[PDB]
Amino acid sequence: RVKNCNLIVDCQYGSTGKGLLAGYLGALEAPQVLCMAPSPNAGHTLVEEDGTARVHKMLPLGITSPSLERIYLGPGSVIDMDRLLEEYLALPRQVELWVHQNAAVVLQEHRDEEAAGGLAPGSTRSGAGSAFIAKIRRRPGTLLFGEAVRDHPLHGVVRVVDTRTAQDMLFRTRSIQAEGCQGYSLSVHHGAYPYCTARDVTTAQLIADCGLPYDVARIARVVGSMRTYPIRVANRPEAGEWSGPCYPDSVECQFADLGLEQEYTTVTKLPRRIFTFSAIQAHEAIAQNGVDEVFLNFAQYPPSLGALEDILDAIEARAEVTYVGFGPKVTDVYHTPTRAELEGLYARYR
Amino acid sequence: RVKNCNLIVDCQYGSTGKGLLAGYLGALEAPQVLCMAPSPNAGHTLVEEDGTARVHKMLPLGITSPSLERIYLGPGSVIDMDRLLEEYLALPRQVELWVHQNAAVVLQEHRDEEAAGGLAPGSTRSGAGSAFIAKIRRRPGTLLFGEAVRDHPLHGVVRVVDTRTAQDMLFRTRSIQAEGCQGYSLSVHHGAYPYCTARDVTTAQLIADCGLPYDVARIARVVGSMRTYPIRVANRPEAGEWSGPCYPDSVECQFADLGLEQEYTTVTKLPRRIFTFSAIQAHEAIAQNGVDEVFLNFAQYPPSLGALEDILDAIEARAEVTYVGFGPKVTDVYHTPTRAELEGLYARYR
Ligand SMILES: Nc1ncnc2c1ncn2[C@H]1C[C@H](O)[C@@H](COP(=O)(O)OP(=O)(O)OP(=O)(O)O)O1
Ligand SMILES: Nc1ncnc2c1ncn2[C@H]1C[C@H](O)[C@@H](COP(=O)(O)OP(=O)(O)OP(=O)(O)O)O1
Ligand SMILES: Nc1nc2c(ncn2[C@H]2C[C@H](O)[C@@H](COP(=O)(O)O)O2)c(=O)[nH]1
Ligand SMILES: Nc1nc2c(ncn2[C@H]2C[C@H](O)[C@@H](COP(=O)(O)O)O2)c(=O)[nH]1
């Protein structure tokens, strides 16, 4: 019964625009089921045609799919139940929300622990690491989602499921979209430790955390997202935290070098760090993840068309650049543009 | 260049005989590279024709391969450097040992922490959970393998590698064998929490922790190992620990019910727990892992040939039983026996 499965994986340090990619593919491929293993580290963003933004930390953004029936948050999820309930109630259309019983739960004590600092440099301090560690530690009395939610208003809108139930549902689903979060180079396996997150960030880890059965993974297509200028989170110098290195064929630059205003963080108001494109990073992530199609986003950032074409050429040595993003809306993503069309798009978006 | 990749995954609670399976497939398929992401929870066993046992906690057991060139311990490894050095020096033939720089390391403090009890019921108390959590927590000063080994005699016999180096090596390898450890139903995602280990135990997690590139995983064959009678570790009643449930279509039994002597644990001398076969568990693990070939081991345990054939019939509803084990040696494993041949083997091994 399964005919299509798209896996969306971030090939840099996050913030490549996976909320946009998810919305775009949701409309293009019309999946019936969205899978995700969210953690509350950052909010992914879908900007509507009218300029309104929907920001999701706990739910996928393929909700543009006209065929959407169900969202399944897998056992590798790390769930803020308050935030999940809030995002669910705000959804535009009614859909079933299934959550695996063994997902971790984020409690205030986990946020409190990370708020004291002294852990990963540049940590979002979302509590995600502490919450996940509590699941992994298996101390008596630790409750995973299946038990923790019974105490919480969220229980009235979720179906708690085990893997037998999830398997049956997924094998009966025609088109599946699974949305990764974070970034390949934040992988605790493949990143520059300790400038990284608490888990691996690969196609394989996404399959594991979403609980996708391996025969479905075998037919899946992998869409890798990357920016023209990779970005890391801000430093926290008062806490003595530098948020980490770039690849050796990247150099750190300033937003002003692109004629852009500095990008600050949502709450703390700290300047994000930007770097030039790394072909080594792109090729390494493409190979690790088995990327079949690349989404190259922020194609309007390079200061010349030649600079954009050099990035395209680097990627295309290893994978097709199937989707090109010139802005934050679904209507700003273009499917396999010719080089001639690319010229017109670049000029128009600058 | 990659032509063959076999992934060995345990479909029950461990102790299905993956050391035997690895030795058998190593000789059958002659891989050039063995991949593993070991943790020190238990020792896997290869019994030689003469009755000698080799017990590995840190190294694969496909070392029967006449074409073996290299062992690669992936970034998801959790490494006791003393034990790894000891096992490496005892290997029969010279091979290259590569270890990913981001593997976790087990220190005495991790063993000490788990030795105090009060964590997962039935824990092996190997320190594996604490050591892995230290990697995940990213506290300043925590050293992963790449830095921790420089202080240790092991550094003289290992090549520390990153993912770019591992990728290049793996893509140039004709035949790869990756050996899972632990058991599907010990998965922190798919198991009965907290009667489980610290990570997922699936094909997907194995790919992630071994650092196998996804395009290699795509061509891989999955060999799932299972026993006629699933087994859990012993209870620890003095510590108030029960080691956990079986599936609902299994019932706990006694070794005496099979005419066998009680199986005790290597050090603590505690009785292992045995249960009848669960078809639900088998089918669930086959589906989650995408198992293509099943190794059914301990085929000499069922008290009648009909009881063995019922187990075979249950498995074969979903996957071929390709290998059948009637004893602990490579010469006790039989490839796709006919039912008539099975009759003679069962009679002879009883
Ligand atoms: N091509 C684009 N041009 C300008 N802004 C864009 C473009 N694509 C996306 N954006 C905006 C939307 C968000 O405000 C921001 C980051 O996108 P977002 O979807 O939140 O990233 P993400 O989900 O990949 O990673 P993160 O984990 O950092 O949230 O960039
Ligand atoms: N068919 C068999 N009959 C009898 N003994 C066997 C058979 N196959 C293997 N053994 C023995 C070898 C070991 O002493 C024991 C468990 O095997 P072993 O390779 O250590 O398990 P394993 O690696 O799958 O799991 P564990 O994590 O418990 O070590 O069973
Ligand atoms: N852009 C982005 N960065 C993340 C995300 N999760 C973690 N990071 C980065 C921020 C830090 O550089 C590093 C560690 O953060 P944390 O996992 O929150 O402790 O990983 C995410 O979802 N998006
Ligand atoms: N047979 C076996 N059991 C294991 C292994 N690792 C963990 N377990 C089981 C023992 C307990 O029931 C449970 C938790 O143990 P631990 O991960 O050591 O805290 O998982 C392994 O490698 N082999």
Side-chain angles (χ1 to χ4, degrees):
Chain A
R1 173 110 167 128
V2 186
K3 295 269 182 299
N4 303 287
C5 185
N6 266 351
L7 312 177
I8 299 172
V9 298
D10 187 293
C11 290
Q12 289 161 334
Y13 305 101
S15 281
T16 59
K18 289 184 301 306
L20 168 57
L21 184 54
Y24 171 88
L25 291 180
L28 188 69
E29 312 279 2
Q32 289 89 14
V33 172
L34 305 171
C35 293
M36 197 183 188
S39 49
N41 310 69
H44 326 313
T45 311
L46 180 58
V47 182
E48 278 313 296
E49 192 52 34
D50 61 8
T52 309
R54 186 181 301 270
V55 173
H56 274 186
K57 304 178 190 190
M58 292 286 118
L59 283 180
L61 276 168
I63 57 166
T64 51
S65 169
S67 306
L68 183 61
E69 302 173 14
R70 180 173 313 100
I71 291 163
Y72 173 47
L73 305 183
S77 303
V78 180
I79 292 184
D80 176 341
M81 293 190 291
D82 294 326
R83 177 71 185 211
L84 172 55
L85 183 53
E86 172 181 284
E87 291 177 5
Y88 176 80
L89 292 174
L91 288 177
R93 296 166 284 280
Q94 183 83 11
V95 301
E96 291 180 6
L97 176 58
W98 288 20
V99 185
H100 197 285
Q101 59 185 19
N102 278 33
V105 170
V106 184
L107 309 178
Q108 186 61 44
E109 67 194 66
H110 304 135
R111 281 184 292 266
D112 291 346
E113 171 179 31
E114 297 202 343
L119 298 169
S123 178
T124 71
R125 308 187 177 195
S126 71
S130 297
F132 176 58
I133 286 167
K135 169 171 163 180
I136 294 311
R137 179 66 283 175
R138 290 150 298 139
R139 200 175 299 278
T142 295
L143 302 185
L144 305 186
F145 182 90
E147 300 290 352
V149 77
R150 306 200 71 178
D151 202 355
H152 191 282
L154 182 59
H155 84 268
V157 302
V158 299
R159 183 183 178 167
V160 175
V161 300
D162 66 5
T163 291
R164 283 170 70 188
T165 293
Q167 281 181 358
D168 175 74
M169 181 272 295
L170 290 169
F171 282 134
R172 297 171 194 303
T173 298
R174 189 175 189 273
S175 288
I176 296 157
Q177 177 167 303
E179 308 183 10
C181 49
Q182 310 179 287
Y184 172 71
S185 294
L186 305 173
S187 168
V188 76
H189 289 351
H190 305 294
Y193 191 89
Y195 306 105
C196 62
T197 195
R199 60 178 158 182
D200 185 28
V201 187
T202 52
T203 305
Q205 192 65 56
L206 180 59
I207 293 158
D209 284 345
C210 286
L212 281 162
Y214 197 60
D215 285 320
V216 177
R218 278 167 155 145
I219 56 94
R221 280 209 281 96
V222 176
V223 185
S225 56
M226 45 187 81
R227 314 159 50 100
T228 50
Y229 290 79
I231 194 155
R232 275 204 185 263
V233 302
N235 300 321
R236 296 186 193 236
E238 304 266 345
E241 292 182 18
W242 180 67
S243 67
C246 58
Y247 268 64
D249 59 339
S250 286
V251 301
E252 189 159 357
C253 56
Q254 303 296 312
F255 278 91
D257 303 330
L258 306 188
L260 307 175
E261 287 279 355
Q262 182 61 55
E263 173 177 343
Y264 293 94
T265 66
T266 181
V267 190
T268 51
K269 295 180 182 297
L270 294 172
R272 309 289 296 267
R273 297 174 54 222
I274 187 174
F275 316 84
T276 61
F277 186 80
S278 165
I280 292 163
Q281 179 175 38
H283 292 175
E284 178 191 335
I286 283 160
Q288 202 62 41
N289 286 334
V291 169
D292 305 293
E293 297 175 344
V294 169
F295 175 42
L296 177 63
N297 202 8
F298 302 83
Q300 84 274 19
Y301 274 22
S304 70
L305 176 68
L308 172 65
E309 292 182 311
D310 289 336
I311 295 170
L312 286 172
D313 292 342
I315 301 167
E316 290 168 347
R318 296 289 203 271
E320 175 186 83
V321 178
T322 312
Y323 317 103
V324 181
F326 282 93
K329 304 174 175 167
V330 168
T331 50
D332 298 321
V333 175
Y334 297 86
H335 196 293
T336 47
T338 74
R339 285 301 170 102
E341 290 167 343
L342 196 81
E343 180 166 10
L345 291 165
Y346 177 81
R348 143 179 180 219
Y349 276 95
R350 279 191 64 92
Chain B
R1 173 110 167 128
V2 186
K3 295 269 182 299
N4 303 287
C5 185
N6 266 351
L7 312 177
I8 299 172
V9 298
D10 187 293
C11 290
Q12 289 161 334
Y13 305 101
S15 281
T16 59
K18 289 184 301 306
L20 168 57
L21 184 54
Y24 171 88
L25 291 180
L28 188 69
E29 312 279 2
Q32 289 89 14
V33 172
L34 305 171
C35 293
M36 197 183 188
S39 49
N41 310 69
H44 326 313
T45 311
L46 180 58
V47 182
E48 278 313 296
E49 192 52 34
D50 61 8
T52 309
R54 186 181 301 270
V55 173
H56 274 186
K57 304 178 190 190
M58 292 286 118
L59 283 180
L61 276 168
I63 57 166
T64 51
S65 169
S67 306
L68 183 61
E69 302 173 14
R70 180 173 313 100
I71 291 163
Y72 173 47
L73 305 183
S77 303
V78 180
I79 292 184
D80 176 341
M81 293 190 291
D82 294 326
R83 177 71 185 211
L84 172 55
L85 183 53
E86 172 181 284
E87 291 177 5
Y88 176 80
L89 292 174
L91 288 177
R93 296 166 284 280
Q94 183 83 11
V95 301
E96 291 180 6
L97 176 58
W98 288 20
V99 185
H100 197 285
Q101 59 185 19
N102 278 33
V105 170
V106 184
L107 309 178
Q108 186 61 44
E109 67 194 66
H110 304 135
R111 281 184 292 266
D112 291 346
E113 171 179 31
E114 297 202 343
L119 298 169
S123 178
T124 71
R125 308 187 177 195
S126 71
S130 297
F132 176 58
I133 286 167
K135 169 171 163 180
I136 294 311
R137 179 66 283 175
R138 290 150 298 139
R139 200 175 299 278
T142 295
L143 302 185
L144 305 186
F145 182 90
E147 300 290 352
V149 77
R150 306 200 71 178
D151 202 355
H152 191 282
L154 182 59
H155 84 268
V157 302
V158 299
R159 183 183 178 167
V160 175
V161 300
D162 66 5
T163 291
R164 283 170 70 188
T165 293
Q167 281 181 358
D168 175 74
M169 181 272 295
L170 290 169
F171 282 134
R172 297 171 194 303
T173 298
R174 189 175 189 273
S175 288
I176 296 157
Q177 177 167 303
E179 308 183 10
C181 49
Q182 310 179 287
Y184 172 71
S185 294
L186 305 173
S187 168
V188 76
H189 289 351
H190 305 294
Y193 191 89
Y195 306 105
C196 62
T197 195
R199 60 178 158 182
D200 185 28
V201 187
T202 52
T203 305
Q205 192 65 56
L206 180 59
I207 293 158
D209 284 345
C210 286
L212 281 162
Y214 197 60
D215 285 320
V216 177
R218 278 167 155 145
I219 56 94
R221 280 209 281 96
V222 176
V223 185
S225 56
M226 45 187 81
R227 314 159 50 100
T228 50
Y229 290 79
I231 194 155
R232 275 204 185 263
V233 302
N235 300 321
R236 296 186 193 236
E238 304 266 345
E241 292 182 18
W242 180 67
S243 67
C246 58
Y247 268 64
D249 59 339
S250 286
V251 301
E252 189 159 357
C253 56
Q254 303 296 312
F255 278 91
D257 303 330
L258 306 188
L260 307 175
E261 287 279 355
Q262 182 61 55
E263 173 177 343
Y264 293 94
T265 66
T266 181
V267 190
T268 51
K269 295 180 182 297
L270 294 172
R272 309 289 296 267
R273 297 174 54 222
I274 187 174
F275 316 84
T276 61
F277 186 80
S278 165
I280 292 163
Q281 179 175 38
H283 292 175
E284 178 191 335
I286 283 160
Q288 202 62 41
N289 286 334
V291 169
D292 305 293
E293 297 175 344
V294 169
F295 175 42
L296 177 63
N297 202 8
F298 302 83
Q300 84 274 19
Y301 274 22
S304 70
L305 176 68
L308 172 65
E309 292 182 311
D310 289 336
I311 295 170
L312 286 172
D313 292 342
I315 301 167
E316 290 168 347
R318 296 289 203 271
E320 175 186 83
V321 178
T322 312
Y323 317 103
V324 181
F326 282 93
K329 304 174 175 167
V330 168
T331 50
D332 298 321
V333 175
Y334 297 86
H335 196 293
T336 47
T338 74
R339 285 301 170 102
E341 290 167 343
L342 196 81
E343 180 166 10
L345 291 165
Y346 177 81
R348 143 179 180 219
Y349 276 95
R350 279 191 64 92

